[PDB]
Amino acid sequence: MKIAVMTDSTSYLSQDLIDKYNIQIAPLSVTFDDGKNFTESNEIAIEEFYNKMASSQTIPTTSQPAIGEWITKYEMLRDQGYTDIIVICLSSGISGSYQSSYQAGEMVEGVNVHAFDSKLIAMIEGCYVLRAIEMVEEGYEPQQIIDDLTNMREHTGAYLIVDDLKNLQKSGRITGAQAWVGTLLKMKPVLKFEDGKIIPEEKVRTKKRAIQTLEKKVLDIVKDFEEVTLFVINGDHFEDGQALYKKLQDDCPSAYQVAYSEFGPVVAAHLGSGGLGLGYVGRKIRLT
Ligand SMILES: CCCCCCCCCCCCCCCC(=O)O
Secondary structure: OOEEEEEEHHHOOOHHHHHHHOOEEEOOEEEOOOOOEEEOOOOOOHHHHHHHHHHOOOOOEEEOOOOOHHHHHHHHHHHOOOOEEEEEEOOOOOOOHHHHHHHHHOOOOOOEEEEEEOOOOHHHHHHHHHHHHHHHHOOOOHHHHHHHHHHHHOOEEEEEEOOOHHHHHHHOOOOHHHHHHHHHHOEEEEEEEEOOEEEEEEEEEOHHHHHHHHHHHHHHHHOOOOOOEEEEEEOOOHHHHHHHHHHHHHHOOOOOEEEEEEOOHHHHHHHOOOOEEEEEEOOOOOOO
């Protein structure tokens, strides 16, 4: 038996982890109506993308990995002797990448494809990749790994803050009054992931208090977990995420694993500027 683990680009794993474990990545893309295209990778400048988003009078569109990017990587790993491929995708409730990875697995002969719906995104989804890789080293078969990841999914979630109200109306999800009235009070919509979908949770005035709301809600949940891994997932507001990150280091015990990360263009294309989230996993994920 020879098991491999791959994922899509929205897992936002560091290039250090990608290189160390030779993780293959099927990238997503974001295409402005300028015709400008950004294929997600650890090479494009995230600052250039945020500048084009502010300059673009229309919101861009994101695309799942094309049914083909999966196929070549499936063919490449099978050639290298891999008998089973575990594919970790972002939430099927917000993207079709999970479906494309499954359908492409039906067209590649001579290798078993085990597509997994993480029901999340960013480094929270990447935690499923690092848990699968760890289990392969310990001698687990793919079915035990899928069952473990399915159990892990039961104690995994995330809350997030929306900051760019201008980006919301450019997409049409809010009005002009609500956009205008919202920025003057500085109302921050707080949302959370639930069964792979993003649903409204609270509406909080000022970003500082919404960050404190993220901390209280997540901490109240992970108190009951035997193992805890917390992930600050920040946008382009460096000071916002660092404040929450350092606040967690002071308020949480060392038994909690607390880490910091940032999301890429595909997530930024939907969140806009100033996005910030707090994810959690009920496990002690190996981040090295
Ligand atoms: C703390 C973890 C969560 C951080 C915030 C993540 C919110 C994600 C927003 C929606 C992204 C949609 C991606 C669609 C991809 C596609 O085109 O198939």
